[PDB]
Amino acid sequence: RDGLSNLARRLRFAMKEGSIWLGEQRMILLHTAALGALRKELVDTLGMERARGLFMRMGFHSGVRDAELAKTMRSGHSDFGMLEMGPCLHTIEGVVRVTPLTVDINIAAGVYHGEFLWEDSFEGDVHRQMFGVAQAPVCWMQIGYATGYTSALMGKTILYRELECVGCGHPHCRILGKPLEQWEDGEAELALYQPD
Amino acid sequence: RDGLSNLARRLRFAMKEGSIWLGEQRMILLHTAALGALRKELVDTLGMERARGLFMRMGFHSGVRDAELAKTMRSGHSDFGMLEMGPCLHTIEGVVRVTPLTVDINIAAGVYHGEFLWEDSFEGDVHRQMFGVAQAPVCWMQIGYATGYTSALMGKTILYRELECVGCGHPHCRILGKPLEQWEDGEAELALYQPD
Ligand SMILES: O=[N+]([O-])c1ccc(O)cc1
Ligand SMILES: O=[N+]([O-])c1ccc(O)cc1
Ligand SMILES: [Zn+2]
Ligand SMILES: [Zn+2]
């Protein structure tokens, strides 16, 4: 659409340089099976908790870099048209089919309240094939990205949580995003986003 | 070499289902910076040697899957034909631009001795900006890839090693693949491909 066809110009493949660039960031195409295998080794080795952390932060970094890109395409787009580049880029990257349910966003006022549908989550899919169906949501990297993108664009922390997840048997994933303090457990969600 | 054009049609973007396909494998587009940041956490917390193995093994799984795909369209393709598909896929993905130097392969006879030139190793050019110049070769995931690809192709253990590598500060990377039996340290090398 207008959010994908436009962000498509920022993507160029250079088989002449063996490289891929999305905006100003170099990219690779990576086999989901390969990342699933890495997940199983990290989970089995560092535990499920330490592992989710590592994936959430990898997602965060990715979401931030795409927010930088989006911000160079500010133009005459609204806050919402700004926001929607995130879901757009997430789709182009082959991670999930993002479907915005309802978004309330003002950047200047520090107001954001967002809810999205996720169809065909790579991360849920991969997780059931490696661990089987899961107790709690598994799209760690995908959530980190949401968190990373939206914080960067708002210049303030916006944590997301998966409300429903394909990893837990549900038909899809579903997520809610809102400012850190608007979260009861928001202090400790933020803790997941720190290395040391 | 010229199989780039052919292999490149196997790669489709399926935005409707938010998914990218290489043959029958689902792929994602991932920022090298984010991958760079996971490598750094892993090196800093698990040890440089222990992270090397994790990425080698992720590479290995990637390679085995491009070999699995290249084994579906071997219509009128010499053994060198099928071998050259690895470098192309690797290049196409955006991991590295690969120059075959001297390839000697006969699958039926167990014959394989390959040397390759690597320019623009994302990995070496990522370990460059996180740990500065390294001392030992640092394109772990990339080498794992060759190893997994050719071993799947030959039906036997082909290990690769880097002779030169940008992450050590040389102009370029250069690799040598050959059967396990023709490596001085081959058995300790095959050991890295096993998970702890
Ligand atoms: O920034 N956002 O609001 C997003 C970005 C990606 C996504 O999958 C969902 C929401
Ligand atoms: O199949 N192979 O021998 C390969 C594959 C990839 C690469 O970068 C070099 C060699
Ligand atoms: Zn999910
Ligand atoms: Zn190298």
Please name the residues in contact with B30: beta carbons below 8 A apart, sequence gap of 6 or more: A27, A28, A29, A30, A62, A93
A174 φ/ψ angles, rounded to the nearest 5 degrees: -150, 135
Ligand 1 pocket: which of A71, A84, A90, A141 to mutate (most atoms within 8 A of CB)? A90
Ligand nearest to the backbone CA of B96: 2
Give how far Cα B148 sits from Cα of A129, B111, B138, Å.
Answer: 21, 16, 17
Alpha carbons A192 and A100: distance in angstroms, whole number: 25
Q: Is A140 in the pocket of ligand 1 (CB under 6 A)?
A: no
d(CA B89, CA B153) in angstroms, rounded, equals 14
DSSP H/E element including B176: strand B173-179
Distances (CA, A) of A62 to A80, A113, A192, B30, B31: 20, 21, 16, 8, 6
Measured CA to CA, the distance from residue B21 to residue A58 in angstroms comes to: 22
CB burial string A72-91: b at 16+ within 10 A, e below: eeeeebebebbbbbbbbbbb
Report DSSP letters for chain A, one per residue.
-TTTTTTTTTEEEETTTTEEEETTEEEEEEEHHHHHHHHHHHHHHHHHHHHHHHHHHHHHHHHHHHHHHHHTT-TT--HHHHHTHHHHHHHHTTS-EEEEEEEEEETTTTEEEEEEEEES-HHHHHHHHHH-S-SS---HHHHHHHHHHHHHHHTS-EEEEEEE-GGGT-SSEEEEEEEGGG-TTHHHHHGGG---
Does the Cβ of B89 fall within 6 Å of ligand 2?
no
Measured distance CA(A30)–CA(B28) in Å, rounded: 6
Nearest CA in chain B to A11: B29
Q: What range does the domain containing B62 cover?
A: 1-196
Burial (CB < 10 A; 0-12, 13-18, 19+), residue A140, is buried
* Mutation to probe ligand 1, out of A145, A147, A162 (largest number of atoms < 8 A from CB): A145
Tokens 């994302």 correspond to: B122
CB B22 within 8 A of CB B89: yes
Query: Which residue in the block uniquely carries the two structure tokens 């080794």?
Result: A41
Ligand closest to the CA atom of residue A115: 1
3-state class (DSSP) for residue B133: coil
Ligand 1 and A3: CB distance under 6 A: no
Q: What b/e string do you get for B29-57 counting C-beta neighbours within 10 Å, with b at 16 or more? A: bbbbbbbbbbbbbbbeebeeeebbbbbbb
Query: Three-state SS for B51?
Result: helix
Rounded distance from Cα B52 to ligand 2 centre (Å):
18
Radius of gyration of chain B (CA): 16
Give Cβ neighbours of residue A123 (< 8 Å, ≥ 6 apart). A95, A96, A138, A139, A140, A141, A142, A167
Q: Closest by alpha carbon to A57, among A143, A121, A123, A181?
A: A143
Ligand minimally distant from the alpha carbon of residue B62: 2
Check: CB of residue B56 under 8 Å from CB of residue B143: yes
Contacts for A55 with CB less than 8 Å, ≥ 6 apart: A39, A140, A141, A144
CB A143 within 8 A of CB A162: yes
Is B165 labelled as part of a ligand binding site?
A: yes
Using a CB-CB cut-off of 8 Å, the residues of chain A touching B33 are 25-26, 61-62, 65
Give yes or no for residue A177 CB within 6 A of ligand 1: yes
Testing ligand 1's pocket by substitution, the residue of A122, A149, A151 carrying the most ligand atoms inside 8 A of its CB is A149
B116/B99 Cα distance (integer angstroms): 6
The full 3-state SS of B58-71, as one line of letters, equals HHHHHHHHHHHHHC
Structure tokens at A117: 């549908």
Angle between helices A122-131 and A140-154 (to 10 degrees): 150
Partner-chain contact A94 B122, CB within 8 Å: no
* A94 interaction partners in chain B (CB closer than 8 Å): 13-14, 18-20, 26-29
- Is residue A22 within 8 Å of A13, Cβ to Cβ? no
Paired tokens of B46 = 């698990």
Whether the Cβ atoms of residue A61 and residue B33 lie closer than 8 Å to each other: yes
Angle at A169 between CA A167 and CA A172, to 5 degrees: 70
Residues 6+ apart with CB under 8 A from B79: B105, B106, B107
**Strand B19-22 relative to strand B11-14, pairing:** antiparallel
Contact A141, B34 (CB under 8 A): no
| Residues 6 or more apart in contact with residue B9 via CB below 8 angstroms | none
CA angle B179, B184, B190 (to 5 degrees): 55
Check pocket membership of B149 for ligand 2, CB cut-off 6 A: yes
Domain count, chain A: 1
Instruction: Locate the ligand 2 atom nearest the alpha carbon of residue B95 and give its number.
Output: 8
Cβ–Cβ below 8 Å for A94 and B25: no
Sheet arrangement for strand B173-179 = B97-106, B111-119, B173-179, B158-164
On whether A168 is known to bind a ligand per the annotation, the reply is: no
The C-alpha atoms of residue B83 and residue B71 are separated, in whole angstroms, by 10
CA separation for the pair A173, A152 (Å, rounded):
23
